[PDB]
Amino acid sequence: TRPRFLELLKSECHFFNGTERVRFLERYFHNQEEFVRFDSDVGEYRAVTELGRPVAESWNSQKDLLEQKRGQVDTYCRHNYGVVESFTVQRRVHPQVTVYPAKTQPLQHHNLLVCSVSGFYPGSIEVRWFRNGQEEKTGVVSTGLIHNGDWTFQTLVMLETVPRSGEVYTCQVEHPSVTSPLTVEWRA
Amino acid sequence: QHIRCNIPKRIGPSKVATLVPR
Amino acid sequence: EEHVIIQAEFYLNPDQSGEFMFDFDGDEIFHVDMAKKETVWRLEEFGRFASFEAQGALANIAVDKANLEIMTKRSNYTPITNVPPEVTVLTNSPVELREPNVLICFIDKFTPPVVNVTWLRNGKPVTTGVSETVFLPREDHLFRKFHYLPFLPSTEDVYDCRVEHWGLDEPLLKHWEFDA
Numbered sequence: 339t340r341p342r343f344l345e346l347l348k349s350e351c352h353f354f355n356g357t358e359r360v361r362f363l364e365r366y367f368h369n370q371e372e373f374v375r376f377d378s379d380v381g382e383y384r385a386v387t388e389l390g391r392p393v394a395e396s397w398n399s400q401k402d403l404l405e406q407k408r409g410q411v412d413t414y415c416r417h418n419y420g421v422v423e424s425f426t427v428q429r430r431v432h433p434q435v436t437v438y439p440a441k442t443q444p445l446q447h448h449n450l451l452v453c454s455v456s457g458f459y460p461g462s463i464e465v466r467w468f469r470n471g472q473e474e475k476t477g478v479v480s481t482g483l484i485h486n487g488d489w490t491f492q493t494l495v496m497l498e499t500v501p502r503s504g505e506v507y508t509c510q511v512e513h514p515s516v517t518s519p520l521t522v523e524w525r526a
Numbered sequence: 527q528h529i530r531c532n533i534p535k536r537i538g539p540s541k542v543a544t545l546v547p548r
Numbered sequence: 549e550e551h552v553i554i555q556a557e558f559y560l561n562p563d564q565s566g567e568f569m570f571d572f573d574g575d576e577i578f579h580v581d582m583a584k585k586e587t588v589w590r591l592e593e594f595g596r597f598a599s600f601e602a603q604g605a606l607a608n609i610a611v612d613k614a615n616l617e618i619m620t621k622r623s624n625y626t627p628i629t630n631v632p633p634e635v636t637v638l639t640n641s642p643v644e645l646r647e648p649n650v651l652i653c654f655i656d657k658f659t660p661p662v663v664n665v666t667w668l669r670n671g672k673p674v675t676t677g678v679s680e681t682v683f684l685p686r687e688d689h690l691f692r693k694f695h696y697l698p699f700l701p702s703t704e705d706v707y708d709c710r711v712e713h714w715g716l717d718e719p720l721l722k723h724w725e726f727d728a
């Protein structure tokens with residue numbers, strides 16, 4: 339309808355090796371345009387665009403403000419990591435795995451073997467297809483990693499193949515929730 | 527057990543709200 | 549980076565709408581319901597592991613709105629450019645007849661954070677058990693949003709996620725049908 343005006347604020351805390359290395363960023367946006375920001379690596383505000391120059395100047399002259407911002411990596415970032423660590427960083431949900439035939443064309447018959455991996459967390463995962471014990475790579479297609487928006491992920495890794503009597507297929511799933519690769523076999 | 531929030535800085539002292547352009 | 553926690557808030561005019569939420573590696577930990585001044589955790593169990601004073605988010609929004617007033621003036625009132633969403637509809641897991649599942653409508657890469665979303669079954673609106681998330685952040689500073697609809701798979705039911713955005717020339721619909 340009418341013209342809209344959007345103001346955005348993001349306070350970011352980036353962690354490397356737990357809280358050993360932490361980086362704080364306070365970023366101000368206007369209509370998708372970041373104009374000014376504080377980066378703990380610099381210790382003061384820096385304009386990102388023309389609009390932010392006068393802002394950076396005014397804020398930077400207030401040392402008491404800069405001191406408080408310089409302490410966020412500790413009293414904000416590390417502090418919050420400590421609080422949510424147990425149910426976020428350490429959260430682990432085993433994946434459910436199923437293998438089933440599918441068609442790349444409702445016309446003919448099944449010529450696609452789908453390895454479905456769902457309900458897992460974190461998102462980091464590895465899926466490999468094996469035919470008669472040998473990894474297959476050229477005919478693999480996937481939906482890629484899919485986020486469900488509810489602290490779970492899923493992915494479909496499909497093998498383009500025409501099953502023949504006697505063949506044995508194997509889907510192998512590697513994920514942080516388990517200390518050994520999970521496998522599901524399918525026999526034609 | 528308490529999550530803290532980061533507090534943004536006011537760009538100016540103006541406390542005026544104006545109806546955005548049509 | 550092994551992990552990232554983002555506190556994201558925004559205010560929009562003339563809609564006068566604002567949101568405050570915490571994101572962890574792309575997922576939402578909680579958001580604040582402005583009107584109720586209550587902390588809404590994404591997963592029920594979280595409220596037993598931590599706490600957040602919702603009152604603080606209201607104070608933050610007040611500042612963000614004040615900054616919007618000033619920056620709208622200093623930027624000579626240049627309006628935000630509409631960016632149309634990309635919609636995807638998929639199920640929570642492989643579908644099986646008569647086995648409870650969930651349809652998910654994933655709206656991504658759009659701005660401003662305003663959209664009309666409707667779940668349609670066989671062409672008729674459905675609201676039974678539908679849920680949704682607030683507007684989630686992206687690294688490119690656009691927005692993401694999820695809509696859910698628990699359903700009972702059948703070869704007799706067709707579904708569509710109808711999405712409306714000011715950057716879209718016409719209502720966008722995504723179809724889904726059981727694969728028999």
Ligand SMILES: *[C@@H]1O[C@H](CO)[C@@H](O[C@@H]2O[C@H](CO)[C@@H](O)[C@H](O)[C@H]2NC(C)=O)[C@H](O)[C@H]1NC(C)=O
Pocket residue numbers: 355356358
């Ligand atoms: C990874 O982070 C750890 C801290 O969590 C860094 O420090 C190590 O800390 C452990 C005990 O917490 C000590 O036993 C090690 O001696 C520390 N590292 C060393 C050899 O100084 C660790 O350095 C980080 N990893 C790297 C190499 O970046």
Ligand SMILES: *[C@@H]1O[C@H](CO)[C@@H](O[C@@H]2O[C@H](CO)[C@@H](O)[C@H](O)[C@H]2NC(C)=O)[C@H](O)[C@H]1NC(C)=O
Pocket residue numbers: 624625
């Ligand atoms: C947006 O800012 C620009 C430049 O600051 C304005 O451009 C012209 O501004 C002069 C006065 O400085 C006016 O006399 C002209 O009518 C403006 N021309 C146009 C239409 O760009 C511009 O007016 C500002 N946007 C508006 C319409 O408020």
Ligand SMILES: *[C@@H]1O[C@H](CO)[C@@H](O[C@@H]2O[C@H](CO)[C@@H](O)[C@H](O)[C@H]2NC(C)=O)[C@H](O)[C@H]1NC(C)=O
Pocket residue numbers: 339662663664712713714
């Ligand atoms: C969501 O739907 C509402 C209601 O249909 C849209 O509001 C209407 O927008 C049209 C412009 O195409 C106006 O002519 C009407 O006057 C509006 N109705 C009223 C009174 O609000 C709204 O634009 C939609 N929002 C989005 C983001 O698509």
